Amino acid sequence: PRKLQDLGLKPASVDPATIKRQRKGKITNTHMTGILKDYSHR
């Protein structure tokens, strides 16, 4: 592809892959263990 444009013939292909591309701690509320739900998101 990088020489097809040099030869004037427009390629119909994108550049292929050969071209460069990209704790647990203690709990104090021991009398209510298990009723609290995890909330890792808003």
């Binding site: 704790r23 701690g25 203690k26 709990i27 104090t28 509320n29 009398h31 209510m32 609290l36 739900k37 995890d38 909330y39 808003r42």
Partner: protein, 353 residues
Amino acid sequence: QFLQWCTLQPENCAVFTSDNKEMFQTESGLVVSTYSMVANTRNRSHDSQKVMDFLTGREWGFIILDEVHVVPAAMFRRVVSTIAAHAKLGLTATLVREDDKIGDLNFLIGPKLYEANWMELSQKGHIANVQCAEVWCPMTAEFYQEYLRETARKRMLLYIMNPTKFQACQFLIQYHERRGDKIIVFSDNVYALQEYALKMGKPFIYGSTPQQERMNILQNFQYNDQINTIFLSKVGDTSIDLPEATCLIQISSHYGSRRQEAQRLGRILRAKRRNDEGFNAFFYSLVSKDTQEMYYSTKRQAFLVDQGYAFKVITHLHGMENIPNLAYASPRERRELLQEVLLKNHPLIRKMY
């Protein structure tokens, strides 16, 4: 604040804390910190020493002193002397202290610029209309007799642990949970907080609690609907992040401190339902009758009534006679609580050991 409400690129902003110590390479910018590092008289680290020397050697044009009520303290009084600034701004919500040194702020920052009219802000919907109420709790004969025969330090825990306040707090929680109100219950005594958490069955947060546990309790309060009451120690009194709530129950307090009342009341002043018509925030102060709670709460409400709030007294609650759950109704359980309060106060030899 500086990143979102004003056009400040992050390269002008630096953080001077324990975890964050990088300092901006520009000629002029922003550094945000706590009074504790600059005013520290102890031995500081070399990086913190370099930051302090840069702060001393650089002429600053303006300083923001958030929560200026801690400025007239012992070492914080020097934060305007080590740091040279032409303009000093004092921003706080509690311009009251128990000592007279609060009146020395004029020697530290300057003349009092502006006083906010709290009724004007409340009637315009800017802040929630708090309903300051004071629920009175009578004494049992044995508890109050034990109150008259001991010293003040034991007396504090004795009038906090009255079963009448337990019944009143349980009834208030039961009443305000049905209305969908988010409830924060403040009490500075950590043993009182633990006893309340054990008796009622609500999460409790104190100073030495794990921080991940504190966040888990906070999001369980904010999002999970089966937890609407959170018990907090003096940690929630200070400027920390807490979820929005409409109901506050103040069981006990650190004596007659006027600052703590407004600090707790400002938590519910930013309620979400302020745009709703007819919304009234609830602020109850549970007091033990004929004891030093009356004196301390009367001293504490002075700043709030000077701001304009009216603390309506409540000596009778409709629902004590037909309450489903009775706390310490039996006399023997009250006695058991009473004596519980009274009883409260060489690489080879290394394997051989």
